[PDB]
Symmetry: C4
Subunit: 259 residues, 4 copies
Amino acid sequence: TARQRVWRAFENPHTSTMALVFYYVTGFFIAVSVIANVVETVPCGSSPGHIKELPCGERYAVAFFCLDTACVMIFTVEYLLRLAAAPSRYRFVRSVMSIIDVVAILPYYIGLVMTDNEDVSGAFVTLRVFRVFRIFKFSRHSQGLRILGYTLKSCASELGFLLFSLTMAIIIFATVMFYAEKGSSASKFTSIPAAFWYTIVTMTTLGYGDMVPKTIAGKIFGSICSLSGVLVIALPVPVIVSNFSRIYHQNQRADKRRA
Amino acid sequence: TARQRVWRAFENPHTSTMALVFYYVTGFFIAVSVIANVVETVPCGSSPGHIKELPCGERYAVAFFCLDTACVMIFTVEYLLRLAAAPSRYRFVRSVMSIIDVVAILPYYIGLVMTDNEDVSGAFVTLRVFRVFRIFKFSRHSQGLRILGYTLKSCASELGFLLFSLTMAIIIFATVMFYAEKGSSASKFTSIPAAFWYTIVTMTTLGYGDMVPKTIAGKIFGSICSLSGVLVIALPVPVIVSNFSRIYHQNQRADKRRA
Amino acid sequence: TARQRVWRAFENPHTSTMALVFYYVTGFFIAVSVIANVVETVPCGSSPGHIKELPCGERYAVAFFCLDTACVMIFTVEYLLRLAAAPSRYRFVRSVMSIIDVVAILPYYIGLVMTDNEDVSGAFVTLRVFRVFRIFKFSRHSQGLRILGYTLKSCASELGFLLFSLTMAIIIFATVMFYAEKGSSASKFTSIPAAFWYTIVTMTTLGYGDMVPKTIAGKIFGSICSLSGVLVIALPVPVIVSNFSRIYHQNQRADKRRA
Amino acid sequence: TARQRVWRAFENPHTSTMALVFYYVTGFFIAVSVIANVVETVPCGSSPGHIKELPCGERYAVAFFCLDTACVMIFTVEYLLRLAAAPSRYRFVRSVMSIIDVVAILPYYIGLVMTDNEDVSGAFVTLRVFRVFRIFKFSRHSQGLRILGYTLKSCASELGFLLFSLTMAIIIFATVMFYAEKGSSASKFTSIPAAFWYTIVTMTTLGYGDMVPKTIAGKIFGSICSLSGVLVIALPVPVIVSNFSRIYHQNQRADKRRA
Ligand SMILES: [K+]
Ligand SMILES: [K+]
Ligand SMILES: [K+]
Ligand SMILES: [K+]
């Protein structure tokens, strides 16, 4: 029944002090890995023996590699233990969180096996991006009751419909703006996909201001887009508020049910 | 009983499998026409024998014309069958979906009969814009768009009042901003219609930043406009969500009446 | 009882057809006055006998003066009739709407009596601004049930508290940003009142981008300001939604009470 | 029974008219100190005998110092009486209003004892910033601030979770934007902390426009970030309004219990 004990330690950390300490140390390692990934891109000053400043990941490549490999060893042993402790190993692997784990650790090994092609580009940057997946294990650690997550799932149909309507509106407004502004001087509306950027920025009430209309027709349709954007940004608030109230009351009723 | 069978197959595609196949085929062609319209404006890049990169709709004008006319023939045939199978031709034409189909289908024929004036300026832009309403045919492919349109129809007098109040506030704030900003050096507030743009951008909380006040009075009234825009973000939500909720409740009442 | 008849015609337009036609013609004159004020600032092209283009109000000064004086005569006779028809003339004058009327018409007469000092500045622009008050008579004409107005009055305490808290937050964040950014190169945070503009723009989620932080401390506190701005723009929506629902239900219950 | 009478006069200014006078006097001095802090940074304009316009706090450093020390002596005396009249000195000091008073009152004395190092850089900025918390003493002058602070205390774990989730999303989006934008020419995404600014600006729907993506991948992920920001505008509203409504209901329950 050893698998039962280790699985109970993993899936339920507060039951045993050993489970709690393992949970806390692996959370600490997750946090240090995230911070190391963020910090290795910060340029170090004083330009030691170089024309320009180097990032922390290049000036201290060995140190950051040691930190990354320590974090990856911890994550790998933890994942293998979870795999060997799962009552249904196939079902555990089919879980989304196991997918997050595997896609978080495998970038390191892929970078290892491509050491011969050290000058790799496009795939190297993509692997370094995929290292961001380690953050998603925080929600395994900050696994507090997902009342907001449950309410977001409660509005999944509304969000899907809102995204479809947003796609329709974006295409329509982008067509209109491109044809209203294709002819301006040094125009940034060089195509309908180019106006996708303006439309998505306007309908979310960002307004960066890099692409702004310069024609009277362009400004009229940009105003229509702005009002549609006000509606877009404003709709979800009462929906989420009502759903959150309902779910919180359901959870309190379940609490008084279990008591 | 053949024409009415065809008509009910049009209304209810899920009944007959052949009707469902025709439904999915026309939906796929709608999506293809929309994507072709969006893509034909993209610059091809490194145009062969041309310094400037031509749009893909100009590099391959023959291929894009053939694809467009294929989609247009499909739409015209489908509309003609919808006209023949419809019991009341006048009322069916009066149905808003029929108007959408008509306004999406003529632009191709208008471009056809206008081939003598192939050197036009402006009108071709309007026709190519009107080609975008092929998207609205997707209303026939979703219950969400149908209920959204019903809600928008419900919020007609109320959203009209909100648009009227927004127009009032826009004129007031544009007046005060033009008069505060007309004297500035190299000012963009050259008139009150010119300040309509700044006012509508500020209320919607875009803030592109192309027109910003540069005087103390202008900045004061811009702050007032910004706060009024914060209120604008909230003004139409009660009406929209109340009408939508009423429609939702009546729909669930009908659904339980079905049971 | 003539005063009774004329007062009933004024305060209740739909009772008599004469009252309705007078109401509609004075509304038409209000609209034409508003449009004339907006249009007289639009620059006329072709620069007739001038170095630069003239606005419609200067190229056609006589025509716009005739239009303005016709509108002012109509407004003046209407206001005098209302004054002579009011059962309590002092109480009628004490009404806010009579104040709006008097402040809408008197700018014209003040401009008349200052014809000797035709080169007046600062007060002339202020009078032309005060001509915007004619728009507020639309809400006398579009006097439809102010459910939104009643709900806004229902939240008057909440809005007052929100403005006080907004003033506190603006002063605090402006102090912090000015002291974080007083030393940057060519800094636009030249004073705490200068940073009032940045703070009010950031806390409303405009982000024009003319004043942006350039220091690490400035960016940190700008991020705190941005989050506070998200809260500011987001709070009023559920409040107004609930109040609107409550007031609409109260009004429907009053309707079924009167029936 | 004199000390406790003084203490209850401090707690309940409306009881004794002399207590109310002292209350309004200290509130007026708080407002005066706040306005003096704000105004002393304004450039005086056309400095006599100086090319650069000095701030009013430097043109009249003696007058502003005298006004500041008057306000500080009033605050120090008022705090000393609050300390003497308080029954439990330790607990009263532990009360948050006492901490606010202390942190607002020391900066003047810290500047006093530091007069030897009158040539400091940076520390004086921190002290002058800490002078802004004289505003928070207005919490003693409003029930709205008190209930707002109680609500913020209630939304402690939940708003902590929201800040944690915002940090997670900010790190993820900053990573993807830095890696999409690091290769651009003259890019402002020089690191992941550098892209923290763009990410937090985009989620809050500011869009200053100083940092904008200039690559197709960057624009795609910026659009995703913009939509996530639209969701951010709605995420904390349910918690805030639910806790505030619970506090409001309990307050009305207590008020009717008073009746
Ligand atoms: K901007
Ligand atoms: K916004
Ligand atoms: K914005
Ligand atoms: K903006």
